[PDB]
Amino acid sequence: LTGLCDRFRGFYPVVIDVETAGFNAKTDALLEIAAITLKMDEQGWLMPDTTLHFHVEPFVGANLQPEALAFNGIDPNDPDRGAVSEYEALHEIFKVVRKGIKASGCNRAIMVAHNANFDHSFMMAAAERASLKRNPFHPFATFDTAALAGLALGQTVLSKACQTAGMDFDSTQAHSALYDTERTAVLFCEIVNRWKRLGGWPL
Amino acid sequence: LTGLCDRFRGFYPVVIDVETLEIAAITLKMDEQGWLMPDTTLHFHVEPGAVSEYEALHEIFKVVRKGIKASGCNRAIMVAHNANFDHSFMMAAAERASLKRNPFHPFATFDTAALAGLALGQTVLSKACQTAGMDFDSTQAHSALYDTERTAVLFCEIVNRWKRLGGWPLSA
């Protein structure tokens, strides 16, 4: 049962990490986003495909409150960032994903992240603000690698899951978005593949 | 390695469903040889013979608290289908009903929609159950007790298949 569109009922997994000004998806600002789409070789093995990355600028009515910013120590309005607009990044991400979905034979995108549902809610609220009416991501489903890894390897913590999975993980580079996203994707793939390897797939 | 506190880094999984107000919880246990199965079922009808929101939670917690201590685990984790929905409600309720010793982890959850995704390539609970060859009657899916029980069996079945194919232990 080769082919990605048969592995998750038409869902096109896309690994996503976000970095934010604060905990609140509706009020607090989006600062950075990384996305990696996945592809499946003629043998049914899963692997990264495209990688995108952006630094985002705070949206208009954003929460730019001293106490809130200070909390996680970042300056969003710092002009030395190479940041693009919320719309620009999401537009570009969605665009790749859409191309991916079409070409893969899938019907919808599903986000893959560690503790996924929180990042998910951030990237939805943002696309709404952006007015991206053709958001290809499922509005509530997510593959959360924390649970997957708990099943797959008995580990729930991203670092520890990676280490156990046999891959290496650099705790220094840690909570930088791209690195995370990238590790996660590999971790997510290993888990899916390892499941095939042990004859879980197909049925 | 044979025992809940070994399987999930010490988390004690508790399958939970909420429906609208009604709530059901099933705890799990492992046999001598390390197969997962339902331990205790709890089911309540709650007013937002219906019990209070405090009672329901207090009683569930009481059971979970006991099971953890008995199985050498360290915290409860909530197993649910699209778990974050139910998990949110729960924690709100716990707070709102001023509950002293909540055993549940504050944001971690085992979501069966994803586990099913991996293990059976289906996301919807009904589909996941049938693919796993379990019985599933959707007319009935509006019942929190029916849903939970199916979810628990499904979850045990995923976890157990993984063992069966040899993905666990990792290597005792």
UniProtKB/Swiss-Prot annotation, chain B:
Its EC number is 3.1.13.-. Disruption phenotype: Required for optimal growth. Significantly slowed cell growth, increased expression of sodB reporter construct. Changing K100A: Reduces affinity for RNA. Transmembrane segments: none annotated. Its cofactor is Mg(2+). Binds two Mg(2+) per subunit. The active form of the enzyme binds two Mg(2+) ions in its active site. The first Mg(2+) forms only one salt bridge with the protein. Residues 14-155 form the Exonuclease domain. The record marks F85, F107 as: Important for substrate binding and specificity. Mg(2+) 1 binds at D17. Changing R7A: Strongly reduces affinity for RNA. Nearly abolishes enzyme activity. Keywords: Exonuclease, Hydrolase, Magnesium, Metal-binding, Nuclease, tRNA processing. Changing F107A: Abolishes enzyme activity. Changing K69A: Strongly reduces affinity for RNA. Changing H142A: Nearly abolishes enzyme activity. The active site is at H142. GO terms for cellular component: cytosol. Mg(2+) 2 binds at D17, E19, H142, D147. One of its GO terms (biological process) is rRNA 3'-end processing. Member of the DEDD group of RNAses that are characterized by the presence of four acidic residues in the active site. These residues are conserved even when the proteins have highly divergent sequences. Trims short 3' overhangs of a variety of RNA species, leaving a one or two nucleotide 3' overhang. Responsible for the end-turnover of tRNA: specifically removes the terminal AMP residue from uncharged tRNA (tRNA-C-C-A). Also appears to be involved in tRNA biosynthesis, especially in strains lacking other exoribonucleases. A general regulator of small RNAs (sRNA), contributes to their degradation. Upon overexpression suppresses sRNA-mediated RhyB-silencing of multiple RNA targets; overexpression leads to nearly complete loss of RhyB sRNA. NCBIfam families: RNaseT (TIGR01298). Belongs to the RNase T family. Homodimer. This is Ribonuclease T. It comes from Escherichia coli (strain K12).
